[PDB]
Symmetry: D6
């Protein structure tokens, strides 16, 4: 069955391969990086930084994706969620299960009150998967991302602890 | 007439006095601080950090407030705006003029495409001043801030470069 | 009226005097200290450590005591509380008022779920103060502290967020 | 026969595996860690820190678990005890034997006056093991740990030097 | 098909060979270097410097050249472009294709307003390539470079964002 | 008579005032700075950097402006020139005299082959000053600077060693 | 009445004056020192070292001597005791009272099991004062100290916690 | 024949194996250590420290034990002696020969005036071997060591240079 | 054909072998060195130092010598020249060709105005090769070098850029 | 009478004032400097560097000039000599006396074999003073210095130990 | 009466004046120094170095000279002695009295076996002083020091512990 | 034939073996060392220290001994000499030949005026070797070295430059 495990430094190569194929502008603890050694230096720099928690999503000891809890705020008890899945594993529905795992970790382990995520308004699939797992649309950010030649809006969706526990 | 000038280290005391009276949870380059020496250490640490630009708002060589451009993104050309004015100067309408100064700096000097801000949904004054100076409501963030005993929603408002230049 | 303000480095001298007359074995972020320069070095070392919050409790710009929230756990949302009042102010009831200030900060600002404290079972007046302000006895720790020649029991008392909000 | 030996750096991998399968929120000298390199850096940082002693409990040159004496206070002569046994060894009674080993070390080598431990009140089998080896119930901590979705009480149990020497 | 990928540290050897056969006076973040270890030290020093972006241009997992965006100015939104192709690949037109790749990255990802480059006025084939891909002649710099015994003029050529988007 | 002297650290305050009233986006060894302590740290960091030479232009022990030779290239023997005069001294012709001083230093002391400068094409009075002192127009840079709301062209002007020596 | 207080860095001068007149071979955390700046550097180096505790002996806010607990062993619960009194205060019997204060601190605060001291066998006064306050002779060390031209034996005397508490 | 040689870092493993089997509380330049990497760090820290000299005791290039001269005092010309022999080599009488080697080194090379050692009063074998090689009983230290559940006295024995040279 | 290439750190061994057989007093950036690790440390220390440029002289990927441009003065545009050739390659006339290569680099790449060298007045071969390639005698330095038992004079020879370009 | 004394850091200001009025290109341990703080940093960096010795030339506790022994070679026993005298003291003949003092120091204290100096061939005064004190012309360096618009030759003069001692 | 006291850092100025008027080539822990800041840096570097002991010799709280014990060898128990007295005090015999003070310190405190000193064979008055206080001539070192133009012999004189104790 | 070569770091092992079998108290730049890593650290620390020169004396690429020039004084032009030959080579006369090699280096390369050495007066064969190669007896040092139980005299022998050149 699908599993989460803490992200190890030895896994960074895999992570890089991910961020290579999906996009070109990747960040680590909100600092931008392009090359693998950049990613390694940021990892070493933020080794004990508790503002972000990252998990490898595994299927029978096989690395199939990455879950990221970023901008963790332990006073307002909220965190932003980001998920990436290897395109060699699309169709198995792993996105929803990994999102559910991350929801369980954030609400049941981290004792968070709110989870939120931001998707491009073109990616209607992402909006449907996230509505599937229980997210509600919270806002529409105007020209939030300059994507390949022009500005794109984004959908911010959110979900809360007590709503999650009762499902 | 009202003026902006670059924030100097020697001004930090004033800043602290501000953040003392208005709230209790203050940040510097997204790191939290309580005491004055904490603020000084963060200032020294982020001295050349260009992700945030801060200005003292002056009235005839008198310090009346603070303007902050934070989360500056030079690729997506956006920045978040925060303003604080000494309560010994409320009524003179300095909030709107300082916001206009910051708008001019961000759009005409920094060449930003978008400015946005976030206010508590209780502060209906802030919503009206910002609508006055031309901001449009962009979203409503749900239980975004734990404020003195319970969660509060927030209004995210925004404004764009070309809209600004034509007014 | 009685108020809290963030502990500044320039206040450490006052703190030292307190911990000198009241106790002889004092700690700073769980490290022991005796001399003033020890306290200063510990302060500088733990300047941004968010596991402890310290406040000077002031009466009309006069320093009257110290409030400490220590062992702050932002996942289990609990913190231990320690209070010291200058013995030149007994009778004004400043202990209970400062404890109430600290309760408001912990429950309404820090969003804590539980506050707890430990007192010597000899000091029945502290137990009476804390029962007054709403703490409940939670346990009795056996021979927890070696006090002036022999072991003493201690009372662990606690209070919870919603019970505080309903009173 | 079962034995203790000092924890070596080369053993950390084993330790990690333990803390991975048993828990997800693990600490090293009261600092939290998730990944293996985090554990290694914390180990290196607290190499000579005498506030904690850790032992590998071995059965015929085979690593079967971990004993931890933490929060060692050499003035009040007390320490908290934590034990972990690989779940591949339930039934051999290794928990009680390792706990007895740790008692002998703490009382006969460290010259401690008191040992205490904290267990979830759900795990009645740990309470039974510790009552077997001579621990007495000392207190019940209310909502001390947020465990998988809700707060749990905890049992604090303790044992003293002369009572151990007479048994 | 021809592609760009982020320059890795492990690629520096290839880069060196390029800059050795093509030129003898090479720079890295505007600091001069001759030997391989010089290049490595400069790379390590400017690892997170965002004023330059470098890409390996690859043809079917084979390293065929180097693209450099230097003097990146995120306020005036302009960058200088430099291209190198292994002389073992003349005729395949890789210069123009790599330049087009770099244009797409600069205008569509970096949100740049202007790209410019400087060529020796002797190399009319580079001027022809750049005119092909859409660059316009902007100026003639007088005796800008001392080349093999005497001074040479240089052609500064440029291209703008909307003109690129409409072609 | 007007004279040049080496820029001292104790002069930085004056420099700041200049760059504050004249511009808002100022650089030091091509790194941007806003506040005074930023300028001081940059000065200390580039103390022995020989790529830039800065002089205070003085009139009878009175500080009247700043001359900067930047981007000094000792192989191609060229340098860019920047001049600032306190606006309290317009009419005395100090700009041209200071520029002549800088020409003498660059051509007769530094043994430079070429001097160049860049001006906004709006400022026809600077172009007139520089044409007076012997500079020739070399090029027109298109939309090189984003100035107060829109892009401006710039004039690049230059002068050579032997032409200077024969005049 | 006579008092102990923690040794402050600002007191080191006084300490030096002591160690100047009594002997010529003085140590700080078992490292030898002669000059005042040597003493200051050792103090700074061992600032948090808990193997030695030092107290200023005060008479009505007047510095009259020094108490030192050295070679503190928190496992075997023993410490060596050293006392020095300003010769401008001999006759008042301050030696015995300061020794009694130090005994109370070691046995009642530090929870020590044994105190011991070593005196030259010539100093028969020291042997009588220490026998007065309850020390028993424990051993005679042969040629233990080379004193001003020849070797001297030493008397090691000791006293235990339970013996102290019952007097 | 039996030999001494300087202790090398590469020998530390052997040393650890010794201190593992004999006792559980081991020190290096008076700092306590448990694990092998702790021992290595202390060795590196005190590499040039001349207050202790350590020798490997060898029998035909085979490591059979360890000799330690600690607390070396070059002014009073004395040193404490400690010897450990692998229990796989008991019976060959190597203890006395290694002690004789160390005596020769201390008196004939180091020019020491006095050697002393401390043994548990239970180890009557150690007292007889040391009396055999010429040590005289010097004192009996009361409850000097907390050994496995209760306090033990110790015998301090010593021997002098001129007495040694004449035997 | 004979070639120059930038000196790499991996070549230092070869260099050492050279400086071993020819002389005994060798320098690196004017600091003296004897052993190989000394040379490596100097190389690492002066890695980016542009006051000296060194080239390996190669014959068909075979290392046959070393060219050194030292005391490079970019203001007076002069540099001292030193050449060393492996004695296993004497007779092929490589000295003159390597000197010609270095002349071309200094005059045509570095834009130097003057090259000079210093030879022992005994080495009449060196004077003839250098006169062959176009050097003119510039001076005779008296007792400039203490060579193997007595002082030797030296011949300083020089050549200029324009003289070189016209041959 | 005229005196030499070791150059103190507190004298650097005077030195700067010298190097300000005479020339514009000044060096310290062969590194170039312009500003006073540059000179201070070089002084601190080369504080124990014995390759250069500098003396203040004093007339009745009044600072009148500077003597520099540079490029000191302790193997070939030679040093270059440089002298600067305040123009407010020209005519008193202090140049020759300071040169004689420096000659005595170099030959009689430093045990040097040769002193040499280099002067511009225009300064015929310097050649006559140095011939006066006993220097012999050793060489004429061609276009050695680029001086204010064109190249100048230099005269290198020298003098030897035994010649000096016999006068 | 004449006395010794440990050399303080604040005394270095006095020391400098001494070594300036008496000599010109002075050393500190065998490193050479000329200027005052050199002496201060050397002092700070060798602060805890026990190979040298320095004393100010004082007459009624007035600084009259310097005593130095250098090259202290605690194994061979020997030290070299150097003495300096302000020339404003010749006739009072302070040299011999200070030398006797130093003898008492070396033989009675440091437990040295031998003291030795080296004087120029010209100074027969120092040889007479040292013969007076009990030194014996031990050797004549040939051309040991280059003194003001030529080599001088030196007298090495010595004294031993028991001979001192019997006089 | 016998030759000298510069001591490399990779040779230290050999050196250690020498100093182990010949002596037990060995020094490196006058700092004492026992173990191999001590020697390595001392070597690394004094890598560029020019006060000592060390050579491996080799016979046909075979390491046969060590030559050391220590206490090199470049002002008084003297150095102490120390020689060690592997005892597996007695009879070949390598001591005298290596000493002659060292003489040639010191007098003909280093331009030294005097060489001196110190031998135990017991070793008459070293005195005979050194008298053979031209050393003259200069002095007899009394009880200079504590050797294996008692003090020994030493012979100081020397040789001068011109006497060497005439033989």
């Amino acid at each position: 069955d699908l599993k989460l495990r803490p992200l190890e430094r030895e896994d960074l190569k895999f992570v890089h391969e991910l961020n290579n194929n999906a996009h070109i502008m990747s960040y680590w603890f909100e600092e931008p990086y392009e090359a693998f050694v950049e990613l390694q230096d940021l990892y070493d720099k933020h080794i004990h930084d508790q503002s972000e928690r990252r998990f490898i999503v595994e299927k029978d000891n096989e690395m199939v994706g990455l879950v990221e809890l970023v901008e963790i705020d332990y006073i307002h008890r909220r965190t932003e969620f980001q998920i990436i899945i290897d395109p060699n594993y699309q169709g198995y529905g792993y996105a929803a299960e990994a999102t559910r795992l991350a929801m369980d970790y954030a609400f049941s382990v981290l004792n968070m009150h709110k989870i939120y995520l931001v998707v491009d308004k073109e990616n209607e699939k992402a909006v449907h998967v996230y509505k599937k797992v229980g997210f509600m649309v919270e806002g529409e950010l105007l020209d939030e991302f300059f994507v390949d030649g022009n500005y794109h809006n984004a959908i911010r969706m959110c979900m809360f602890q007590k709503q999650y526990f009762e499902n």
